[PDB]
Amino acid sequence: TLQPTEAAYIAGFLDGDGSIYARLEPRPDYKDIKYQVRLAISFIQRKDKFPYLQDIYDQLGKRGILRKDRGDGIADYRIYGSTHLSIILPDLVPYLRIKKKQANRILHIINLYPQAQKNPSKFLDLVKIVDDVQNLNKRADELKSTNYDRLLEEFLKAGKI
């Protein structure tokens, strides 16, 4: 497993060249709610320093997927899923500074995901944190995400409340 100063480093580095986000991805094939909430952390870097993502990956139990080239010389390492994340984040949260919040919102989403799954009213609360999160990843002067307001609208238009 992970040592304090390796967790601290990864956290330090994540605050630098990394990213903690949530997404609301449309689903045509889904049931009632045609949207899967997607969660991840990532590390971006110039492919020549790839062995350094490499390193990190291996330090994080080989969860997530490395990508020696995103097609533009820039390499990366993306960790999807509440599974990987609920193991990883707690180790990193105590050392995160800039993206610490984001990491807790994600954990928070993770607590409420099972009850919100088949429950349109609760899936909306969940989608709000998804908004708040992507907001955290913004300039205070950029357009503030609005998945909560466009999903509700649609849930009413479809008589799900």
Added chain:
Amino acid sequence: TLQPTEAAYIAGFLDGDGSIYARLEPRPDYKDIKYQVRLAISFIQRKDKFPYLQDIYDQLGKRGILRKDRGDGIADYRIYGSTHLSIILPDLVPYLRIKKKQANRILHIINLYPQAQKNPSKFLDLVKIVDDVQNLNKRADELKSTNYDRLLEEFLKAGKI
């Protein structure tokens, strides 16, 4: 002073949003050798996250100078001088990965600076590491720095060897 996982974090973060460089700055006012070698580490970031540089600064004994805005909304924190650096780097070196080398070259320059000061032959060795350093901070496909070769040339042209 500095704790392991705070040093680890700073190192992690430096490897991300920071920079370790050496420069050869021209001096019209100098004596024989009209060039001062300049050494530093820095942390760059969007000014809204400034309190986070802040943090780091204070964790690094308030050495170096913060800059809430470089004129382009981007804030920073620059630490010049062998003085600050010979105290700081050793705490960070054990946790540095990507810029670890650079940190040791700097330390290395720091060992040889006093003898190379008034000694054109030795000042050249020193200026080579200065080259190697800025090379480390490059794409393997970029033009490889050449302070060693343009300073020598000039030292001969001026009969200093």
Added chain:
DNA sequence: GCAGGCGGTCGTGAGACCGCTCCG
């Protein structure tokens, strides 16, 4: 149906510096 493996991509936010002004 349930999601994660992937491929992609605009828009900045960093990096790695150069030159001056200043100060014991």
Added chain:
DNA sequence: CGGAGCGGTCTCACGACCGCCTGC
């Protein structure tokens, strides 16, 4: 002097995502 405070700037290297193909 001998260097460090400070302003300033090109060129990318990131970030924070979208949309689709893949697995069972």
